[PDB]
Each structure stands twice: as C-alpha cells, then as structure tokens.
Amino acid sequence: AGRLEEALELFEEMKEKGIVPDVVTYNTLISGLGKAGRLEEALELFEEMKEKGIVPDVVTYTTLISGLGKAGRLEEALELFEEMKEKGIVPNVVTYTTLISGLGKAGRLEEALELFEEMKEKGIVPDVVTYTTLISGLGKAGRLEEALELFEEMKEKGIVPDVVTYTTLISGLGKAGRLEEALELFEEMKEKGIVPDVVTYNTLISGLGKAGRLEEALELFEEMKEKGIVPDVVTYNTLISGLGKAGRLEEALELFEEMKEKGIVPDVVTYTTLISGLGKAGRLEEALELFEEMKEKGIVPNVVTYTTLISGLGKAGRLEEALELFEEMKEKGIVPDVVTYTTLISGLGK
C-alpha cells in the first residue's frame, strides 16, 4: 500500500516504546519515501540509521540514488555512489544505469563513459538501457562515430538494439549526409524484426530529399504508408521541397492535394515552394489561387511569397496586379527588398 504517513507514525511509536529499528525498518521507509519523491525525509532517515549504528546495504543506496536520480539531484546521487563504494557496498546494474542515464541526460558524456568502463571492470553487465542511454547521449553531442562503436559493441555482447537505438543512429547519419550507412542500418533494423516508426522514415526521406534522391524518397514514402506508418507535415514538406527543386512541379502539387485529403496541415514552406514553382513556370492563375488559399487557412505570407508573385506577375506583363500586391505586402508589414523593387521598376520602365 502507499500508506506512508501511517508507516512513519508507527516508526515514531516503536522508537518512543524503546523498540530499536533495524536495516529492514529503514529500507522499507526510505524505499517508500524515495518512491513518493520525499527525498529530504528519505535522506534524514538514512543519516539517522547511520547515527544509530544501523548499516545501510545495496537496497538503501540504490533506492536513494534512484530517487535522487528521478528528482534531477544528480550531484548528490554521485556523492552517495562514491560513499557506498567506500563502505564496501557493491553497486549493481540499476545503480550504474540510473547514474549513466542522469549523466547522459545532462550531456556529461565523459563521466557517463567512465562509469560505463568502471561497471565492466567490476563485473557488472550493461544492458539495453545502458547502451541506449549512452548512444542517445553521444548522438545529441554530435559524437556519432563513438555512438556507432558502442552499437557494434552492444551487438557483440548479444544485447539486442531497439527502435530508439536505430532511430538515434539513423538520425545522426542522415544529418551528416552519411545516407548509405543510414540506409544500411534501416535494412538491418527490419531484418532483425525492429519496426521503424514516423521518426525513422522522416529522417531517411529528409536525408534522401536533401541529396536529391527522390525516387528512393518516394519509394520509402510509399513503404511507410503500406506499413501503417502515418506521414506528418515534415514528411510532406520534405518531399514537396525535394520534387520542387527537381522541377517535378505536378507531382509536388499532387502530394499537396494528398496531404490536405489526409488532414495534414501545410505551412508557409509548403505554400512558398509551390508558389515559386508555379511562378517560375508562368502558372500565375494557380500561384494566385494558392496564395488566396494560404490566407484563408491562416498561413501568413512572407517576403519570398510576395517576391515570387511580383517577379512572376511582372515577367507576364501583369504590372497593375504586381503593384497591388506590392501595396498589400507593405500594408501587412512585410518589408520589400532589392528584387521586389527592381522587378517593379523593370516592368514600369519597359
């Protein structure tokens, strides 16, 4: 039960009656307090048991360190960990894992790695949490090659990686343009029965899109849909941006229609790529319809949107409409630039 207040009341009573509490009494209470996040009181009882000649054990220390770890009190958890080792108390996997997770989360990777080396030397065997924690930590720091080396090591030790491990690595590799390796980890992940998620697919599609390998990006987009994975605003913007750069305007407009059909909300980036694409193609009636639609949908145009339409309208001799959008642009607080002015001056001077 979570009846801690009564447990504490009974503890006060036994001490008044002259009954001496033992390691069991203290461990239960400290464990109860640690689980309730009442760590100042858990630490008072730990000090009290020590003064009373009661000797703490692995459970006492692990409960306190777990509790202080969950409270963001990392420096105090590391101090108790040094203390437990001085008293000859042997730390276990839980102790090492809670500390490495805390250190990892704080970006204290040199110390997280020293504790990981130490647990191996003391015969403590790391598990999926130990490795995942370190991989995530190293990943966030840009320390990708070190993360990859621990991934190789974890597999040699028969520790099975999960979605988190793979997704952290694929993300880091895709960001660095190391696509062939990202794709290799993706193939391995599926082969081992690990199920990719929206994060796995979006990273690879972003990566492939930014490298202009769009047929592959589209193949993976089709695959995620067949696998029951749901594309989001990022998946769609990446593909639209990618196909837009490739001059594949009609396919980018078809995905834009698809995304709205699936209730995915397009942003300023989606609308802009399309408006520029259409503008560049002289498809001004359609660029203007999308411009009207983004306003009805709450999407606020910026200087690129206005410039594209002005440059577009200008090139088509549609000068009075270009001038009207120029006025609107200034009414809406968007600041014109060299391009906006030079486009209008050309058309007017012509």
Numbering used by the authors: 18 to 367
Q: What did the paper state?
A:
PPRs stack on each other to form an extended solenoid structure that can recognise RNA in a sequence-specific manner based on the identities of amino acids at positions 5 and 35 of each repeat. To bypass these limitations, we previously used consensus design to engineer artificial PPR domains (cPPRs) that are highly soluble and, via an appropriate choice of amino acids at position 5 and 35, can be designed to bind RNA in a predictable, sequence-specific manner.
Next, we sought to obtain structural information on the two cPPR proteins specifically designed to bind to telomeric ssDNA sequences, to understand further the cPPR scaffold’s ability to bind both ssDNA and RNA. Although these proteins are highly similar in their primary sequences, only cPPR-Telo1 gave reproducible and diffracting crystals. Mapping the electrostatic potential revealed a highly asymmetrical surface charge distribution with positively charged residues in the ssDNA-binding cavity and a negatively charged band along the exterior, exposed face of the superhelix. Our structures provide the first pair of structures where an identical PPR protein compacts upon binding a nucleic acid in the canonical, sequence-specific mode, providing an opportunity to understand how the conformation of the protein changes upon ligand binding. cPPR-Telo1 wraps around the ssDNA upon binding, inducing a massive compaction of the superhelical structure and decreasing the length of the protein from 104 to 64 Å. Overall, the rearrangement is based on the a helices on the concave side of the protein moving into closer proximity as bonds are formed to the DNA with a concomitant separation of the b helices on the convex side.
